Amino acid sequence: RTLFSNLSDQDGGAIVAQLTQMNIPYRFANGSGAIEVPADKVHELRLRLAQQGLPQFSEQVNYQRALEGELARTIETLGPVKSARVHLAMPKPSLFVREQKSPSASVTVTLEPGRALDEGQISAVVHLVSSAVAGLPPGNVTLVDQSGHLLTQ
């Protein structure tokens, strides 16, 4: 299954280097800028790579919803995470001409009783989400737990 698509050559190369190091089989889709990898490893690998810093309405909505769902699924592969919800809020093509807008994301996680996300895991989530959405800076990702505690500084 596709690990990543639409990668820069630089990111692609970095991702391939990491996969080789981890001894994970991979197949870079020919001229598809995509890297199909073991289906059962896709989510774990996305997270791991994120930790290393790598890399119509209805459709949009659907797309957005699909993206949200995928991101949630990936985040749920983290050990301490029981469930995750991702909400993406990219304003519709800035109607206002002068004012400038920017995409943001809100991530809510339900943690396993007695478990917490560490700083690394938190950073991985933030990176994963930011990388998935064009123009979404890490700073515009808010990560909260079930109790509403802000995890991202």
Binding site: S147, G148, H149, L150
Partner: peptide, 27 residues
Amino acid sequence: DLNDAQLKFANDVESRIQRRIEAILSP
């Protein structure tokens, strides 16, 4: 410049007070 920093400071304070209220009002 400085006004934006002050406004962000106010926004963070308000958000944290909001979260503290929500934390006890949730259970």
